[PDB]
Subunit: 262 residues, 3 copies
């Protein structure tokens, strides 16, 4: 039961961190791992394998960590190593950290990702608030009659707060596609016609899970590349990571500043 394992994850967190309430959570996207040191000093580092429900039962492999990091007046659960739908596991594992985090008291999820830039003004290394998404996975992490209203899925308030920290932060619609392949240029023209400014392979489920769980969502894309076909520059995951690395100190400091304003 996802809610059960989430509650049980949250007991482990509170137990092992000594912290009954982590007020905020962050999921670090592709390339955002080096941003951790910029976020602050982890006080607890929890192997995700030690937390109920974080690891898909099968396809074994050394999952990442959940950090408890004091950021301003918040204990923040920071997810380092996430599961993506394209790994082929149930979405419950994709969104488990949001649910676990919510069970541990997280009222804000900061959902970060690497994204391809579609909108003309967006440039590589530029962080972009997600104002909205297009879930183009044909999936939901919610599994029977759980309506969730997705109006303001990406809290305008958290965005204003984000902008108080960085007033020039652009915002954009993010299209979540399954991946793990990147888009054809024709897909990218499609996405633009669909109203996407950003394209990625995560986030949408986590946002939906977050909202269903009663949490607010700040989405932040790091534009790591302009989306396929826009310039002709070939996309690569190693370019996405390297872009995230080159931008990671700034991204961490951005998040720390923004999260402290929450």
């Amino acid at each position: 039961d996802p809610d059960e394992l989430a509650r049980r994850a949250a007991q482990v967190i509170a137990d092992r961190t000594g912290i009954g309430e982590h007020d905020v959570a962050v999921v670090l996207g592709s390339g955002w791992l080096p941003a951790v040191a910029a976020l602050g000093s982890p006080t607890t580092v929890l192997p995700q394998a030690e937390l109920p429900g974080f690891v898909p039962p099968t396809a074994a492999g050394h999952a990442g960590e959940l950090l408890s990091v004091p950021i301003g007046a918040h204990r923040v659960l920071v997810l380092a190593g996430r599961i993506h739908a394209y790994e082929g596991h149930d979405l419950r594992y994709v969104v488990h950290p949001v649910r676990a985090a919510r069970a541990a008291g997280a009222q804000i999820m900061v959902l970060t990702n690497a994204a391809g830039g579609l909108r003309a003004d967006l440039q590589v290394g530029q962080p972009v608030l997600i104002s909205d998404h297009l879930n183009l996975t044909a999936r939901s992490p919610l599994v029977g009659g759980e309506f969730v209203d997705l109006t303001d899925a990406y809290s305008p308030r958290l965005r204003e707060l984000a902008r108080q920290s960085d007033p020039q932060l652009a915002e954009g619609v993010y299209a979540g596609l399954p991946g793990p392949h990147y888009e054809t240029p024709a897909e990218i023209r499609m996405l633009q016609t669909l109203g996407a400014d950003l394209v990625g392979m995560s986030t949408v489920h986590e946002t939906i899970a977050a909202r269903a769980a009663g949490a607010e969502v700040l989405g932040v894309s790091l534009v790591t590349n302009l989306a396929a076909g826009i310039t002709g520059e070939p996309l690569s995951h190693a370019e996405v990571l390297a872009a995230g690395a080159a931008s990671a100190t700034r991204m961490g400091a951005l998040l720390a500043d923004v999260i402290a304003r929450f």
Copy 2:
């Protein structure tokens, strides 16, 4: 085998109803349950659990009913309680009532749903004939080489007939999305660009199954809300049901009048 269980469901129906041919079938959408009393007097009430193939093997729970209701010169199988793709069961259970109904002689499926209104003229409580759909689930209830031509999936004739009953019935394209989450406003702008007038979480599979089974389809959406972001009014399932309730007497009477014209 879906066709087998459908044939076997149809034997149960004919046996328990005493009616060899139900000429029409109705699937009642979200909120349309109170419309039953408006449809007429059920002569037989069949627990869906007593009909082969209606209940997904696992995820147990007290399924609904299939009513045999005389409506005009028709015995009409009326599905009260339906299964939605978002329940996570195979689409065969989503569309089993259409197939069962077709096996019991249904030549017309009346597929009703609650939908969010996208088109400018559509208002809450307004019934809307489905002129067509966008199946945006990336799925089909058909499972190997079963081509079905979906040209006129929503019989223009049944629509004209529907309009003979209610000449001001608008019509619209319905986008079937998986749910169970409602759309982001950005998704709703996407859908509009895609040509949808209505958005929901059912119908498309049933229509496809219906057409594959050789049956005609009248789709009717009750607009229960304007789609996300159009007004800013938050979407809720309880608003969808309450809208369906407020509109249910009319909807039942509409369907009874329309079905008798068939």
Copy 3:
């Protein structure tokens, strides 16, 4: 493991054909089976059931063949009988022949299909190079962190080469949908707004698999019908096959000429 069975398929091929490297592969689409005799003389005919990984474990049935055909200075693996996603088997079986073929040395995949024509100039019996695709299946045949850049998924060079053979070959964006149902006219207007010139039920996975495997892709659609609603002419699979048959000699000769230019 798809790569393992692919390598093992390739050993079988090299063993049974006596040919260590098949430089090219062709997947024949719906209706393209009669084009085989036009392609050349098969030197080996391999039941797909005798090749590791070609047949889905369950849903048994007499799969087709993989032909080794000398075409110009190439040994070409020609897939006769393919698996489509709509058969409900894992995509690994959909794309196994591309992977097997790549393991047997194929550097070019020629991916042929029947498609519905959306673009105004496209006519029935007209072959159309795929310049790009819209993967509208919400799926990928790649299964964990396998980025594949899909920029130039359909090699412009192979297209120019194709055009050296037939300078009037049009090109078009192909939208791969799951099927097996054909589109509603509203879906077809959607697809056009999305930038599709052609619509089908295959190819996109094979292209993605091909590219992931390091192979170049020539896509060729035979326009078998104008897409749903464009003319009103009802779509049928038997029309698709008959169109493919009427056009098969030409299509085979086209492919033979084009493949020899590779």
